[PDB]
Structure formats: C-alpha cells, structure tokens
Design a protein around this motif. Structure first.
Motif, PDB file in Angstrom:
ATOM      1  N   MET A 138       0.826  -1.199   0.000  1.00  0.00           N
ATOM      2  CA  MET A 138       0.000   0.000   0.000  1.00  0.00           C
ATOM      3  C   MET A 138       0.862   1.251   0.000  1.00  0.00           C
ATOM      4  SD  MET A 138      -1.090   2.600   2.128  1.00  0.00           S
ATOM      5  CE  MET A 138      -1.009   1.988   3.826  1.00  0.00           C
ATOM      6  N   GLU A 139       1.917   1.251   0.818  1.00  0.00           N
ATOM      7  CA  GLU A 139       2.790   2.411   0.947  1.00  0.00           C
ATOM      8  C   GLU A 139       3.502   2.705  -0.359  1.00  0.00           C
ATOM      9  OE1 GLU A 139       5.015   1.068   4.398  1.00  0.00           O
ATOM     10  OE2 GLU A 139       3.296   1.473   5.689  1.00  0.00           O
ATOM     11  N   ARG A 140       4.020   1.666  -1.011  1.00  0.00           N
ATOM     12  CA  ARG A 140       4.652   1.860  -2.303  1.00  0.00           C
ATOM     13  C   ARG A 140       3.639   2.400  -3.292  1.00  0.00           C
ATOM     14  NH1 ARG A 140       8.320  -2.795  -4.511  1.00  0.00           N
ATOM     15  NH2 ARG A 140       9.847  -1.491  -3.400  1.00  0.00           N
ATOM     16  N   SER A 141       2.430   1.849  -3.277  1.00  0.00           N
ATOM     17  CA  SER A 141       1.395   2.334  -4.183  1.00  0.00           C
ATOM     18  C   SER A 141       1.106   3.814  -3.964  1.00  0.00           C
ATOM     19  CB  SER A 141       0.121   1.505  -4.005  1.00  0.00           C
ATOM     20  OG  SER A 141       0.265   0.209  -4.570  1.00  0.00           O
ATOM     21  N   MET A 142       1.152   4.282  -2.713  1.00  0.00           N
ATOM     22  CA  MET A 142       0.879   5.696  -2.460  1.00  0.00           C
ATOM     23  C   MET A 142       2.028   6.569  -2.961  1.00  0.00           C
ATOM     24  SD  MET A 142      -2.203   5.477  -1.367  1.00  0.00           S
ATOM     25  CE  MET A 142      -2.185   4.136  -2.548  1.00  0.00           C
ATOM     26  N   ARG A 143       3.273   6.095  -2.815  1.00  0.00           N
ATOM     27  CA  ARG A 143       4.412   6.800  -3.409  1.00  0.00           C
ATOM     28  C   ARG A 143       4.293   6.845  -4.928  1.00  0.00           C
ATOM     29  NH1 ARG A 143       6.996   3.532   0.640  1.00  0.00           N
ATOM     30  NH2 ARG A 143       7.818   2.107  -0.948  1.00  0.00           N
ATOM     31  N   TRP A 144       3.867   5.744  -5.526  1.00  0.00           N
ATOM     32  CA  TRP A 144       3.645   5.696  -6.969  1.00  0.00           C
ATOM     33  C   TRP A 144       2.443   6.525  -7.406  1.00  0.00           C
ATOM     34  CZ3 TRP A 144       4.646  -0.076  -8.710  1.00  0.00           C
ATOM     35  CH2 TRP A 144       6.001  -0.356  -8.537  1.00  0.00           C
ATOM     36  N   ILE A 153      -5.872   4.887  -6.845  1.00  0.00           N
ATOM     37  CA  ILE A 153      -6.329   3.543  -6.461  1.00  0.00           C
ATOM     38  C   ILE A 153      -6.031   3.289  -4.983  1.00  0.00           C
ATOM     39  CG2 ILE A 153      -6.211   1.098  -6.952  1.00  0.00           C
ATOM     40  CD1 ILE A 153      -5.094   1.832  -9.733  1.00  0.00           C
ATOM     41  N   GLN A 154      -7.072   3.046  -4.193  1.00  0.00           N
ATOM     42  CA  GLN A 154      -6.917   2.676  -2.792  1.00  0.00           C
ATOM     43  C   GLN A 154      -6.472   1.226  -2.664  1.00  0.00           C
ATOM     44  OE1 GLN A 154     -10.366   1.516  -0.652  1.00  0.00           O
ATOM     45  NE2 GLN A 154      -9.944   2.893   1.071  1.00  0.00           N
ATOM     46  N   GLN A 155      -5.494   0.977  -1.777  1.00  0.00           N
ATOM     47  CA  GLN A 155      -4.990  -0.369  -1.470  1.00  0.00           C
ATOM     48  C   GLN A 155      -5.150  -0.624   0.030  1.00  0.00           C
ATOM     49  OE1 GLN A 155      -4.343  -2.718  -3.662  1.00  0.00           O
ATOM     50  NE2 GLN A 155      -4.144  -1.615  -5.588  1.00  0.00           N
ATOM     51  N   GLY A 156      -4.547  -1.712   0.528  1.00  0.00           N
ATOM     52  CA  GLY A 156      -4.695  -2.059   1.933  1.00  0.00           C
ATOM     53  C   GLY A 156      -5.308  -3.421   2.200  1.00  0.00           C
ATOM     54  N   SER A 157      -5.489  -4.218   1.148  1.00  0.00           N
ATOM     55  CA  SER A 157      -6.008  -5.585   1.262  1.00  0.00           C
ATOM     56  C   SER A 157      -7.324  -5.541   2.035  1.00  0.00           C
ATOM     57  CB  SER A 157      -4.930  -6.491   1.852  1.00  0.00           C
ATOM     58  OG  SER A 157      -5.385  -7.825   1.973  1.00  0.00           O
ATOM     59  N   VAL A 158      -7.517  -6.398   3.036  1.00  0.00           N
ATOM     60  CA  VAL A 158      -8.771  -6.499   3.760  1.00  0.00           C
ATOM     61  C   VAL A 158      -8.706  -5.753   5.090  1.00  0.00           C
ATOM     62  CG1 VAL A 158      -9.400  -8.663   2.634  1.00  0.00           C
ATOM     63  CG2 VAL A 158      -8.156  -8.697   4.815  1.00  0.00           C
ATOM     64  N   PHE A 159      -7.692  -4.903   5.287  1.00  0.00           N
ATOM     65  CA  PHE A 159      -7.403  -4.320   6.595  1.00  0.00           C
ATOM     66  C   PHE A 159      -7.900  -2.880   6.656  1.00  0.00           C
ATOM     67  CE2 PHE A 159      -4.058  -7.411   5.554  1.00  0.00           C
ATOM     68  CZ  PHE A 159      -4.431  -8.390   6.445  1.00  0.00           C
ATOM     69  N   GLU A 160      -8.826  -2.622   7.574  1.00  0.00           N
ATOM     70  CA  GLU A 160      -9.466  -1.310   7.663  1.00  0.00           C
ATOM     71  C   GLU A 160      -8.460  -0.174   7.889  1.00  0.00           C
ATOM     72  OE2 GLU A 160     -13.455   0.414   9.885  1.00  0.00           O
ATOM     73  N   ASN A 161      -7.474  -0.366   8.774  1.00  0.00           N
ATOM     74  CA  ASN A 161      -6.525   0.706   9.064  1.00  0.00           C
ATOM     75  C   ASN A 161      -5.697   1.085   7.836  1.00  0.00           C
ATOM     76  OD1 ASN A 161      -5.074  -1.851   9.349  1.00  0.00           O
ATOM     77  ND2 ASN A 161      -3.396  -0.665  10.238  1.00  0.00           N
ATOM     78  N   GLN A 177      -5.559   4.660   5.812  1.00  0.00           N
ATOM     79  CA  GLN A 177      -4.313   5.344   5.480  1.00  0.00           C
ATOM     80  C   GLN A 177      -4.223   5.591   3.979  1.00  0.00           C
ATOM     81  OE1 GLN A 177      -1.177   2.931   7.068  1.00  0.00           O
ATOM     82  NE2 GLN A 177      -2.051   2.989   9.132  1.00  0.00           N
ATOM     83  N   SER A 178      -4.640   4.609   3.178  1.00  0.00           N
ATOM     84  CA  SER A 178      -4.560   4.753   1.730  1.00  0.00           C
ATOM     85  C   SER A 178      -5.517   5.829   1.232  1.00  0.00           C
ATOM     86  CB  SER A 178      -4.815   3.401   1.058  1.00  0.00           C
ATOM     87  OG  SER A 178      -4.654   3.487  -0.356  1.00  0.00           O
ATOM     88  N   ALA A 179      -6.753   5.826   1.731  1.00  0.00           N
ATOM     89  CA  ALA A 179      -7.707   6.847   1.313  1.00  0.00           C
ATOM     90  C   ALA A 179      -7.224   8.238   1.702  1.00  0.00           C
ATOM     91  CB  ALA A 179      -9.077   6.559   1.933  1.00  0.00           C
ATOM     92  N   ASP A 180      -6.643   8.377   2.893  1.00  0.00           N
ATOM     93  CA  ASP A 180      -6.169   9.680   3.336  1.00  0.00           C
ATOM     94  C   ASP A 180      -5.013  10.167   2.469  1.00  0.00           C
ATOM     95  OD1 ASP A 180      -8.092   9.701   5.317  1.00  0.00           O
ATOM     96  OD2 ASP A 180      -6.716   9.152   6.938  1.00  0.00           O
ATOM     97  N   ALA A 181      -4.077   9.283   2.136  1.00  0.00           N
ATOM     98  CA  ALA A 181      -2.973   9.668   1.261  1.00  0.00           C
ATOM     99  C   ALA A 181      -3.464  10.089  -0.119  1.00  0.00           C
ATOM    100  CB  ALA A 181      -1.979   8.510   1.133  1.00  0.00           C
ATOM    101  N   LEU A 182      -4.400   9.329  -0.689  1.00  0.00           N
ATOM    102  CA  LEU A 182      -4.887   9.658  -2.020  1.00  0.00           C
ATOM    103  C   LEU A 182      -5.630  10.985  -2.026  1.00  0.00           C
ATOM    104  CD1 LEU A 182      -6.277   6.213  -3.197  1.00  0.00           C
ATOM    105  CD2 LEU A 182      -4.130   7.286  -3.984  1.00  0.00           C
ATOM    106  N   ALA A 183      -6.449  11.237  -1.002  1.00  0.00           N
ATOM    107  CA  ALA A 183      -7.138  12.517  -0.923  1.00  0.00           C
ATOM    108  C   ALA A 183      -6.152  13.669  -0.749  1.00  0.00           C
ATOM    109  CB  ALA A 183      -8.150  12.501   0.213  1.00  0.00           C
ATOM    110  N   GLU A 184      -5.049  13.452  -0.022  1.00  0.00           N
ATOM    111  CA  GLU A 184      -4.058  14.512   0.148  1.00  0.00           C
ATOM    112  C   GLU A 184      -3.368  14.833  -1.175  1.00  0.00           C
TER     113      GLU A 184
END
Ligand SMILES: CNCc1ccc(Oc2cccnc2)o1
Ligand SMILES: CNCc1ccc(Oc2cccnc2)o1
Ligand SMILES: [Zn+2]
Ligand SMILES: [Zn+2]
Lengths: 368, 368
Positions: free
Chosen positions: B157-163, B186-194, B198-205
């Motif tokens: 997920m973290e790499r995806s947000m950098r990308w 694209i939001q990532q994070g598999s099945v994990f809510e946290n 984090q992914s949604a917040d990064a993408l919105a930023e």
C-alpha cells in the motif's frame, strides 16, 4: 411472384445481364453468391450480407446435414428462418464435400465430425434440400477428378445424367418443393467436347430451370477452364441461367461472364478475408504484411463499403495479426462488398454495351 | 465541455446516480465499461458497442503497449481514431497484467508474445496513456495478492501511495494531458481497515478526479469483497466517482452499487459470451447445453437488444457449438446489452427512490 422467371435484359457477345425473379426476391445477373457454410456467411450478420448488395447466398448441404441436421432445421422452420436470411438461397447437393462406399444408388460416408455414418443419393439429397427449404436446388451428381481419362470421364458423366433424371423425378414428386423452388442440372464431361455435348443434350432432354457447368476449377488452371467454357456454355439452353460453381478470383469471374456465365459462388472472399487477403482494384493485398502497419488509407480508396469508410489498413493489419474476431469481420465485409461492386460493374457495362472495354480496363489495372 | 465534472443527481442509502461530463461525452453512473483489450471490444464494431448503451470503454495498456505499441498508436492519431470509438476511454495502468524484476522504480518484464523486454513505471505508464490519448488515466500501483499478511499489505500500500504521487506529478507535467484528461487514484490495503484508511487519506491529500477501490475481486469471494467495501468506500471523497475495477457478475455489481460504487469494468460479458454463457434475468445459461438445441425463444424474452429481436437460442446454440464467429458476435452483443440494461435499471431505480426494492427483486429472480 413467379416460382422462377429468368429474363435477359441485355447482351454483349456471349455475355448477358438480367434478372431471376423468385418468390423470395429478385436476383440480378451476373450474380455472385456468398457461401453460407453451416447456416452462416462466416463473420457476417445477414443484414450485413444484404448491405453489401448480395441478392442470394449459397448453403452447403453436406455441412448442414451433419450439424445441426436437416430434420432439425425443418422442425425449427427452415433454413431462412433459422439463420435470419429471408431472400433466395441456393443449396448444393452435398456430393462434392463427401468426395473432399460408392455405387449407382449413391454414397455412404463417415462424418468428419464424429465418424457417424450417413448416406447421400439423388433422392436423399433432394429431400435434404426440401427440408432446408432452399429456393434453388442442385441435382446430385458424381464428380470427376482432374485429370480424368476419357473412359472415366464418360462413365462419370453418364452416371451423373442418370442421377440428374432421378433428381428431377424426386423434386417433381414433392408438391411443395416443385411449386416453390427451382431445380438446376449440372453438365459433366471433364475437358472433352463430345462428352460435354452429350451431357448438355441429356440435361436439356430432362429439363431444368438452370444449368451449371460442373467439373471445373478443380486444378486445371484458368486457360484450360476458359477453353472448356468456350465450347461448353453454348451447348446449354440459351434462355436459362448458366451457373459456374466454385469460381472464383475476380479475373476468373470476368472471363467466365465473357463466355456466357450468369451465376457464381466461391469461398475465396470469405475464407481468404479471414486469412488476411483483401481484394482491391489494383489486385489483392495481404494486410498482414508489415508495409501496411502505418498505412492510414482504407483497404481500397475507391470502394464504397462501410469498412472502407471507417477503418484504416493499419488498424485491420493489427487486428488480423492479433487474431481478433473484428479483423475477420471487417476483412470479410470488405471482400464481399468488393465482389458485389464487381458484379454491379459487370451488369452495368453489359447493359451499356461497354463490357468488353470494362473487362480490358479491369484486367490492365488489376494485374498492374 | 469541461475536462471533468461529476454531478450526483440522486441518492438512496449509499447508492448514487449521476453523470461525468468530459470533453468526449457524458458518462451516466453507475456505469459499466466494456473491456476493449487490444483496441477492440472483442467481436463488436464500435457502433454496436454504442448501440448497446455503453458510454465509455476500457483499454488495456499492457496489451496495447506490446501490440501495436503506444508510439505507433500516437503516430496514427491516438486510440480513438485508430479503433473508431470517439467517446470516452479509460485506460488501466498496465501494472496488473505484468503481474498476471520489480523495484521502487517500477517493473521490467518479458513480453508474453515474443520475450521482448519492456519496462513500466509511474512515469512510463502515464506516458503510455498520454500516447494513447485516453480520457481517464489510471495511476500506476503495486498489486497486493490475496491472501496477504498485514506487513506485506502495508508495504505494498505504501509503495502504491508513493507511486500515486509520482503518477500525479507525471500527469500534471504533461500540459495537453492535464488539460483534457482525468486521473484516478487507487486505494490499497487488502482487507485491513486501518491500511484502507491510510490509503484513502494519502490519495485525498494528493488529489484525484476519481478513486478506485483496488485489490478486490482477486479470489476473496463476494462476502469478503462486500465486507471490505462496507468500510472502504466511505473513506473516499464522497463528491468524486468510486470505481471498482474488474467486477463483475450482475449480483456483484448490484451489491457494490448498494455500497457506493459508481463505475465498473469486467471481461465477464465478453469473455464468457464467447465461451457460451448468456446472461438472462433468470440467471446465466450455457447456450451450448443440449436443452437449447430446439428452443425457439431468444436468449432472454424481455431483453431489448437486437440479438433477442432476431435470433433464437437454438440458432445461437448451433453457432457456438460449431465454433462460428457469428456465435461469438451475437452472444457478446447480447451480454453487453444485458449489462447496459442492468445499469439503466439501477440508475432509474436510484433516481426514483426504489433501488433497494429493485436489488431485492433482481436477486430473488436471478437466483431462482
Ligand atoms: C458415350 N456416352 C453416351 C451417352 C450419351 C448420353 C448418355 O448418358 C447415358 C446413356 C445411357 C445410360 N446412362 C447414361 O450416355
Ligand atoms: C503503516 N502505514 C503508514 C502510512 C500511512 C500512509 C503511508 O504511505 C507512506 C508513508 C511514508 C512513505 N511511503 C508511503 O504510510
Ligand atoms: Zn471496402
Ligand atoms: Zn438480448
């Protein structure tokens, strides 16, 4: 609407143009029939086949009798209803594909699909074509290979004439078929003028609605095909259609019309289209060739078809290389439209007394 | 025409209906995008795709970059001109198909067609999508397999947000692309809510025109997919489109709309159509099954598509069994039309405040 009326509107030399009026529509001649194999002209909806200008299609009895079966098609309302083509259909007899136990009664064979055993005879072929509901029914004959000895060509021609009489009697015994369909006989005799004459005389004595020149386009080559047509077509009744089965390339068609042929079918535009060959007024091209990968012109820059109004050589090149279904669809629509535009040019030039000039101009450009 | 304007006309629960206005046209949402692989929606002319009701199609960057190549498509005028579709196109990033040497810079891979070596990165993916000229561009991400450990899901997920940030900057650096196209994250994070949060917040930023829920429909099953959507979609900005990639069956679509999804793509209607599966309001059928061999009803007796006005189950059964191209054409047109009719029913029911009832009635009949 009459069951069958052939009218010749104009002539030039041996060439003729006119119409066949049938219950399901009018066929403009000279005519080219797309081949609709197993109840489909491959890769085209019937409305698209019609949009190209086709007036009639051919159906292959051999394939239909194996899948889905003629009885099933009849139970479902006939071939026209089943495939969604409401205009005339000519069906072959099935016999040629059996070739590609035999006796005077007919042939038994094993299906190429599953080894099941089937039978064809004059009577069963006519019955299958009745079940399909086709408008033009072909007599069942015995094909003669090329080359053939005079003795073998004679024996096969003679059997074919006996089978033509049986085909005639079977067709006449089926009230609904005899009242609404037409029956064509097939001349045999290989490359031998005397046997061709005997065959034409026998067929005329039996009487048919039209007459095919059989036994050509089986490996003899164009010069020999043209030489046999030179003497064979004038032996047939002049006032009925002359059908050359399984022909052919555009230049085969033109020279055959110059020799008195009115009707043609062939797999070339459909099959070679799926394989990447496109017909153009400057000759055929293989669209897969790398020289077309960035060519933004249409397949042919004078063609009236919908494919040439919308898509480039470069795009079609990509589709065929990729094995995409749309590549087959577009190449097939174009090639059938090209063939119909050729037939229209032939009909117009004969009607205007300038067909000999058209044929010369066509060949000069097509072969350049 | 604006570059991008999403307007929500009506809501019911979490479901929304509205429009995306773009320079090449309006997209009605919820929307289903037919997949147009290598510059073709398989077996359909673009006019037929449009006739079914589709407003936008998807193009696969991975396939296009290998054949015919993105540079070639650009030289020929872009993907719209090349394939003859003038309405919006969404392109994926190419990354998923590479999965189906990797580092922080991107991925190098060998082509499945000829072993040639290629590269993808955030920057090169955006460049390829610029060369194609697509209207909706997908950020390049790193896919997470299912199942994934929390650590692996976090790292990916973290790499995806950098990308995603690199994708954003590459897109913004291309003046003509930034002015005329839209960019989705694209939001990532598999099945994990946290991690999803984090992914949604990064993408919105970073800021995107729309937001996909990635990493689903990869083997987890519908219940788990729905559970993840339950918490993941509300994390995305409400005022932008929500895109669920690679989904799905009709019942997947309905339940995803109930959870706030606005856009879908999938290969199912086209691929399963060519394989003989037809969608109906009473569930899917396999047209090859012998029970259809003499069934004169259309594929579905309420469907509005052209195939169901003209041809029978029995005919289509025969075509598919015979391997005929027309079988693929007809099944694909019907299935895409079915999908578009489903989306229309969804849009209308939301607009009328009766979508929850529609979803219940749909499921009761489809699963009976
Ligand atoms: C050398 N051919 C003689 C000939 C002319 C017409 C036919 O056809 C026949 C004649 C008798 C029996 N079977 C076929 O044969
Ligand atoms: C445990 N995940 C922390 C987290 C939230 C957002 C991101 O994304 C990042 C942060 C720093 C570097 N690379 C990616 O990570
Ligand atoms: Zn054309
Ligand atoms: Zn339908």
């Amino acid at each position: 609407r009459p069951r069958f009326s052939f009218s010749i509107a104009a002539r030039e030399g041996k060439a003729r143009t006119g119409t066949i009026e049938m219950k399901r529509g009018v066929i403009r001649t000279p005519a080219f029939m797309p081949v609709g194999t197993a109840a489909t002209v491959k890769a085209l909806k019937p409305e698209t086949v019609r949009a190209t200008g086709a007036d009639i299609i051919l159906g292959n009895t051999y394939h239909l009798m194996l899948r889905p079966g003629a009885e099933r098609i009849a139970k479902l309302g006939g071939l026209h209803s089943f495939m969604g083509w409401d205009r005339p259909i000519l069906t072959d007899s099935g016999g040629y594909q059996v070739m590609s136990k035999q006796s005077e009664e007919g042939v038994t064979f094993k299906s190429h699909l599953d080894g099941s055993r089937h039978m064809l005879s004059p009577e069963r072929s006519i019955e299958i074509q009745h079940l399909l509901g086709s408008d033009i029914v072909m007599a069942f004959d015995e094909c003669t290979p090329y080359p053939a000895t005079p003795s073998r060509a004679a024996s096969s021609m003679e059997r074919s004439m006996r089978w033509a009489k049986r085909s005639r009697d079977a067709f006449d015994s089926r009230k609904e078929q005899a009242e609404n369909a037409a029956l064509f006989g097939i001349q045999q005799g290989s490359v031998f003028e005397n046997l061709r004459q005997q065959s034409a005389d026998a067929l005329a004595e039996i009487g048919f609605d039209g007459y095919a020149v059989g036994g050509l386009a089986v490996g003899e080559g164009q010069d020999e095909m043209f030489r046999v047509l030179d003497f064979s077509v004038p032996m047939l009744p002049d006032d009925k259609p002359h059908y050359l089965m399984g022909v052919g390339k555009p230049d085969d068609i033109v020279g055959a019309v110059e020799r008195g042929i009115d009707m043609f079918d062939c797999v070339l535009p459909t099959r070679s289209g799926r394989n990447g060959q496109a017909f153009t007024w400057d000759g055929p091209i293989n669209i897969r060739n790398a020289r077309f990968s960035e060519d933004l012109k249409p397949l042919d820059s004078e063609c009236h078809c919908a494919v040439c109004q919308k898509w480039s050589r470069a795009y079609i090149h990509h589709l065929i290389r990729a094995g995409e279904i749309l590549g087959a669809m577009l190449m097939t629509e174009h090639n059938i439209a090209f063939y119909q535009q050729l037939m229209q040019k032939i009909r117009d030039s004969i009607s205007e007394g300038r067909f000999s000039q058209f044929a010369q101009d066509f060949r000069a450009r097509y072969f350049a």
